[PDB]
Design an enzyme around this catalytic site. Structure first.
Site, PDB file in Angstrom:
ATOM      1  N   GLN I   2      32.314  40.566  35.841  1.00 35.88           N
ATOM      2  CA  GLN I   2      32.769  40.249  34.500  1.00 35.88           C
ATOM      3  C   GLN I   2      33.362  41.441  33.776  1.00 35.88           C
ATOM      4  O   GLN I   2      33.054  42.601  34.056  1.00 35.88           O
ATOM      5  CB  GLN I   2      31.645  39.655  33.678  1.00 35.88           C
ATOM      6  CG  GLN I   2      31.220  38.344  34.212  1.00 35.88           C
ATOM      7  CD  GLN I   2      29.781  38.084  33.972  1.00 35.88           C
ATOM      8  OE1 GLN I   2      29.391  37.709  32.870  1.00 35.88           O
ATOM      9  NE2 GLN I   2      28.975  38.241  34.997  1.00 35.88           N
ATOM     10  N   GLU I   3      34.234  41.115  32.830  1.00 37.35           N
ATOM     11  CA  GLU I   3      34.948  42.083  32.018  1.00 37.35           C
ATOM     12  C   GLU I   3      35.706  43.061  32.907  1.00 37.35           C
ATOM     13  O   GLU I   3      35.447  44.263  32.930  1.00 37.35           O
ATOM     14  CB  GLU I   3      34.004  42.812  31.071  1.00 37.35           C
ATOM     15  CG  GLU I   3      32.882  41.948  30.556  1.00 37.35           C
ATOM     16  CD  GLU I   3      33.343  40.901  29.579  1.00 37.35           C
ATOM     17  OE1 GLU I   3      34.534  40.905  29.203  1.00 37.35           O
ATOM     18  OE2 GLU I   3      32.505  40.056  29.197  1.00 37.35           O
ATOM     19  N   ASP I   4      36.625  42.495  33.679  1.00 36.57           N
ATOM     20  CA  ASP I   4      37.701  43.240  34.321  1.00 36.57           C
ATOM     21  C   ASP I   4      37.213  44.079  35.490  1.00 36.57           C
ATOM     22  O   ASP I   4      37.985  44.819  36.097  1.00 36.57           O
ATOM     23  CB  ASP I   4      38.425  44.107  33.294  1.00 36.57           C
ATOM     24  CG  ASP I   4      38.912  43.295  32.115  1.00 36.57           C
ATOM     25  OD1 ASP I   4      38.903  42.054  32.217  1.00 36.57           O
ATOM     26  OD2 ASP I   4      39.332  43.875  31.092  1.00 36.57           O
ATOM     27  N   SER I   5      35.945  43.945  35.856  1.00 31.61           N
ATOM     28  CA  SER I   5      35.459  44.676  37.012  1.00 31.61           C
ATOM     29  C   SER I   5      35.852  43.944  38.287  1.00 31.61           C
ATOM     30  O   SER I   5      36.530  42.919  38.257  1.00 31.61           O
ATOM     31  CB  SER I   5      33.953  44.857  36.936  1.00 31.61           C
ATOM     32  OG  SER I   5      33.603  45.474  35.725  1.00 31.61           O
TER      33      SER I   5
END
Ligand SMILES: [Zn+2]
Ligand SMILES: [Zn+2]
Ligand SMILES: [Zn+2]
Ligand SMILES: [Zn+2]
Ligand SMILES: [Zn+2]
Ligand SMILES: [Zn+2]
EC number: 2.7.7.6
Lengths: 43, 79, 279, 53, 65, 112, 110, 49, 147, 45, 56
Positions: I2-5
């Site tokens: 999550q969040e661009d990882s």
């Protein structure tokens, strides 16, 4: 009248070499010379 | 056509590669003609170094503005 | 009273200080016993990274000028006035000779090193009743040849003389007495590269000339009495070893020796070539 | 190494070179070798002689 | 650079296909899709690798050493 | 406040001298021992103190007399504010300006 | 920890600002600074009477700070003063000085 | 097991970037102070605070 | 994710995926002031030199240097430099035995490591010898790295 | 005497101290450090 | 005793006497006899509270 005393060569060579080496351009201007950016070709 | 005055005194052509690793400066000298003269007042009774000029690479004054691709390898400069 | 601090272990007192230094966390620790001694070891390195006292010594002053928020009057007063406080120091005659050799060492391309020595020796004496003037020039001529003769480079007197006219004699004494100055204030090969450097030669003739110059001196033929002569005949005969176009006519007009000693140098060396065959 | 490759960059790929491994069980593991860290009981030693001739 | 040893995802045999790949092209005037096919690379994670390798080292070798 | 704030004291009479810690000696390889802009701005003002001393000890050209005072009053101003409007930017040897005290406090990355 | 000291510990409660009686500036100052020559002219430790003299705060962790003893980490610095032949404006106040005089007779001074 | 919904899937060109972690990590417990304000020095390579 | 990882094939890594080289280079030069002060590349010792770095030198050669290919970690002094000390001048404690020379050597970054790659030697423009060392280390993708 | 190399002839100069910065078979002017015959054990992990 | 190196270890033992020991470079002295009042710089462990920010 001797020539080599007459003309101080450094007057130019020292001028440019410096004024390249830092974007200082006189002062009166900066940001004009950089190290080149060799990260990746496109850069 | 560009060169270096080494400290000893010797002078010689310089290749962009060697400039980078000797922390040198890729310049070429300048020469102008001087007319030293006199008048005494209504009447009048060589070649001169004036500095070192850095040169943009791949310019006519740079060794490389002709050099062959193969030699670029012998010049150790990525073509 | 000496107002000192000797650093020392309070729980060892064993010895002169046998500790170690923990810069990267700022402490000195009793290497043996394990106890810290000092703390908040300040940066001693990042200190300098930002930025002539061997000559100038202790005095302080500054280079200054006009601003952006200024008019030509304040430009003019700090132009005239910052000339008015230079007579407090003879150092005008200290600074200017620098500025003289500064100009000059440049003009004949000399590196930073020659200049600094040729500056440094100029601090060393700078004067004596013995020197008592001496033209303020032949000294400066000598003030650089010493630096050169010390910068591992060597120049003939004719050479700096053909940079500065000094009549060479009062100079020659001035250099002599200058040498004996630093004697109390306490090598003919070097020319050969630069010689051939203008001659566009390759190193072998130079190197060969060295062993030729090497052989001539040791055996006999005390060779030259002004032996830059034999340094030259070495060049010529070492290009007499070669087929490459170096007419002594060219040599003399370009090394500044009438070819008579070139013949003669080569002459005893047309006799001493026999024991001058290493290759 | 004269070559243009950085060393381990070779040594890396020297990792991924498949090997005959039928009689693998007759070989026991490195860790379980009391040997001086390798021996004919635990490992196989290969070497190379490459020359740009 | 040099023709990675076997693929990131599959891992099938590449450190052989490389030059075989080539002779196909010059000699057989042969299309890629056909080529890798008669190279026996029917999956495509591999039909990535060789298709988009760059054989650079054929530049470094130009340099005198 | 006559006990703390005297207009008498609005005009600088004796200068204190902040000891080294304020203006430390940056001290590298037994040789590369530089000092802060303040260091000089004492010495210069120390010099501009002693010159105008003698000019009034010995002699009175009575217009150059004015000068080292305009000069002294100039420096001490700079020493206390390098960026002053309608004046020269009193530069350093390195050409760049002098890090005057007010500049140590000016704004972002001042002391405060 | 810093070396012990017996003066009872308190914390500031008031800060009174103000200016110096120059008298005070001398009255405290341990030093009259004289010779712009910075440190010991013989290129040893330090120039006395000069722009940083050992009467003031000391350095290199090896000096001892003549008045207040050794610790660089404890010498809070000790003040020099310099006297001015000619009184000089304090920049920060000129606007108020120019403000001042208009309020006063230049002759009476009242 | 099967996955109760179907996935997007292909190759795609990716770039790597300088900003590797091993350049961005550091921690400090009583490092070296400054000269001036005796505060912990700045600068990651320098054991900054 | 999550969040661009991202989640990376830990395997593919083992097949050189995204691995990359990294080339630090180091610089130095020995310079003089009246030549009475003379910097000198050499191996300094805890027997006669003062103010000596905490790491090891013994990877230093007698010429103040290191053969290329030698492994180094952080805090391994790379180039052995030494500077003149005057006895009468400083008196920093331990001077009463050495009176020889000061260390200003340039270690490897305490934080980096790898294999020496390429050591060269030249004079600078103005005749002072000066040496560059090039460091090579490999960089595998790890958790943090930005893609 | 220590083996150093030049970037214009690739010849094991193997010189010592007190010598002009130069090489044989080409007037060349830079030299390298010529890696060690001492082994270097590998963690090829 | 675990020294500064394996994780649940410590770096600094403080003697009430204003007195601080690095646990490495004192392994020569080995195990000491601790006492009350003395301070100890353990490594962080679980369930310590720590203050945790993202600038701005
Ligand atoms: Zn102890
Ligand atoms: Zn085994
Ligand atoms: Zn695949
Ligand atoms: Zn004090
Ligand atoms: Zn009135
Ligand atoms: Zn060669």
């Amino acid at each position: 009248f001797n020539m080599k005393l007459a003309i101080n060569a450094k007057t130019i060579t020292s001028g440019l070499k410096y004024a390249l080496a830092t974007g200082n351009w006189g002062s009166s201007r900066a940001g004009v010379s950089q190290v080149l950016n060799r990260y990746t070709y496109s850069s | 056509k560009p060169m270096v005055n080494e400290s000893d005194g010797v002078t010689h052509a310089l290749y962009p590669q060697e400039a980078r690793l000797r922390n040198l400066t890729y310049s070429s000298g300048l020469f102008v003609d001087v007319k030293k003269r006199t008048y005494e007042l209504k009447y009048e009774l060589g070649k001169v170094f004036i500095g070192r000029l850095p040169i943009m690479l791949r310019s006519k004054n740079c060794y490389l503005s002709e050099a062959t691709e193969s030699d670029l390898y012998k010049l150790k400069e990525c073509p | 009273p000496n107002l000192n601090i000797v650093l020392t272990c309070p729980e060892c007192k064993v010895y002169p200080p046998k500790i170690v230094e923990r810069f990267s966390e700022g402490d000195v620790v009793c290497a043996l016993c394990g106890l810290v001694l000092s703390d908040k070891l300040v940066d001693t390195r990042s200190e300098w990274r930002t930025f002539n006292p061997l000559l100038d010594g202790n005095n302080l002053s500054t280079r200054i000028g006009k601003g952006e928020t200024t008019d030509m009057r304040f430009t003019k007063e700090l132009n005239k006035a910052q000339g008015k406080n230079v007579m407090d120091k003879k150092d005008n005659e200290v600074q200017a000779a620098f500025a003289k050799i500064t100009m000059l060492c440049d003009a004949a391309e000399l590196p930073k090193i020659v200049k600094d020595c040729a500056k440094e020796a100029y601090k060393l004496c700078h004067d004596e009743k013995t020197l008592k003037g001496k033209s303020m020039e032949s000294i400066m001529a000598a003030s650089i040849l010493i630096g050169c003769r010390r910068a591992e480079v060597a120049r003939t007197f004719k050479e700096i003389q053909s940079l500065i006219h000094v009549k060479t004699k009062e100079f020659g004494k001035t250099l002599n007495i200058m040498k004996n100055i630093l004697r109390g204030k306490s090598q003919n090969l070097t020319y050969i590269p630069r010689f051939c450097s203008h001659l566009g030669l390759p190193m072998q003739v130079t190197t060969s000339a060295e062993y030729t110059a090497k052989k001539c001196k040791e055996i006999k033929e005390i060779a030259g009495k002004s032996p830059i002569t034999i340094a030259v005949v070495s060049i010529y005969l070492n290009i007499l070893l070669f087929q490459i176009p170096i007419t002594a006519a060219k040599v003399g007009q370009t090394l500044q020796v009438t070819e008579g000693t070139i013949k003669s140098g080569y002459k005893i060396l047309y006799e001493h070539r026999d024991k001058l065959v290493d290759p | 190494n004269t070559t243009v490759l950085a060393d381990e960059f070779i040594a890396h790929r020297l990792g991924l070179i498949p090997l005959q491994s039928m009689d693998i069980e007759q070989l026991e593991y490195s860790r379980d070798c009391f040997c001086e860290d390798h021996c004919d009981k635990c490992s196989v030693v290969l070497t190379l002689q490459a020359f740009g001739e | 650079m040099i023709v990675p040893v076997r693929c990131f995802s599959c891992g099938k045999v590449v450190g052989d296909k490389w030059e075989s790949y080539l002779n196909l092209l010059q000699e057989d005037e042969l299309d890629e899709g056909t080529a890798l096919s008669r190279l026996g690379l029917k999956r495509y994670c591999c039909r990535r690798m060789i298709l988009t390798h760059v054989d650079l080292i054929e530049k470094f070798l130009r340099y005198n050493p | 406040n006559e006990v703390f704030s005297r207009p008498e004291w609005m005009i600088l009479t004796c200068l204190p001298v902040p000891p080294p810690p304020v203006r430390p000696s940056i001290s590298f390889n037994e040789s590369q021992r530089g000092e802060d802009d303040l260091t000089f701005k004492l010495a210069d003002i120390l010099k501009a103190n002693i010159s105008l001393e003698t000019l009034e000890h010995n002699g009175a050209p009575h217009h150059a007399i004015e000068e080292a005072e305009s000069l002294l009053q100039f420096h001490v101003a700079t020493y206390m504010d390098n960026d002053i409007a309608g004046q020269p930017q009193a530069l350093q040897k390195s050409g760049r300006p002098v890090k005057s005290i007010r500049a140590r406090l000016k704004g972002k990355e001042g002391r405060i | 920890g810093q070396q012990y000291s017996s003066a009872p510990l308190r914390t500031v409660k008031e800060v009174q600002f103000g200016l110096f009686s120059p008298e005070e500036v001398r009255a405290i100052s341990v030093a009259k600074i004289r010779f712009p020559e910075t440190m010991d002219e013989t290129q040893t430790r330090a120039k006395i009477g000069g722009l940083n003299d050992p009467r003031l705060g000391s350095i290199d962790r090896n000096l001892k700070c003549q008045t207040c003893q050794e610790g660089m980490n404890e010498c809070p610095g000790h003040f020099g003063h310099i006297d001015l032949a000619k009184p000089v404006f304090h920049v920060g106040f000129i606007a108020k000085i120019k403000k001042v005089c208009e309020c006063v007779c230049m002759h009476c001074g009242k | 097991k099967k996955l109760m919904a179907q996935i997007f899937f292909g190759p795609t060109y990716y770039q790597r970037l300088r900003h590797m972690v091993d350049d961005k990590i550091h921690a400090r417990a009583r490092g070296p102070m400054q000269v001036l304000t005796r505060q912990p020095v700045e600068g990651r390579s320098r054991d900054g605070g | 994710n999550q969040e661009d990882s991202m989640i990376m094939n830990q395997s593919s890594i083992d097949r050189g995926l995204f691995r990359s080289l990294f080339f630090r280079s180091y610089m130095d030069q020995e310079k003089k002031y009246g030549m009475s002060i003379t910097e000198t590349f050499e191996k300094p010792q805890r027997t006669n030199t003062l103010r000596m770095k905490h790491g090891t030198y013994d990877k230093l050669d007698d010429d103040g240097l290191i053969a290329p290919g030698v492994r180094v970690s952080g805090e391994d002094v790379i180039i052995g430099k030494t500077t003149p000390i005057s006895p009468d001048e400083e008196e920093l404690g331990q001077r009463t035995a050495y009176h020889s020379k000061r260390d200003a050597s340039t270690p490897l970054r305490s934080t980096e490591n790898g294999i020496v790659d390429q050591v060269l030697v030249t004079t600078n423009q103005d005749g002072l010898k000066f040496v560059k060392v090039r460091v090579r280390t490999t960089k595998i993708p790890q958790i943090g790295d930005k893609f | 005497t220590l083996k150093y190399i030049c970037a214009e002839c690739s010849s094991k100069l193997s010189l010592s101290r007190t010598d002009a910065v130069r090489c044989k078979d080409c007037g060349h002017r830079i030299l390298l450090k010529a890696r060690t015959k001492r082994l270097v054990q590998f963690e090829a992990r | 005793r675990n020294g500064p190196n394996e994780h649940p270890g410590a770096k600094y033992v403080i003697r009430d006497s204003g007195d601080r020991i690095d646990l490495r470079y004192s392994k020569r002295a080995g195990d000491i006899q601790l006492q009350y009042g003395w301070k100890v710089e353990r490594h962080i462990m679980d369930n310590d509270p720590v203050l945790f920010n993202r600038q701005p």
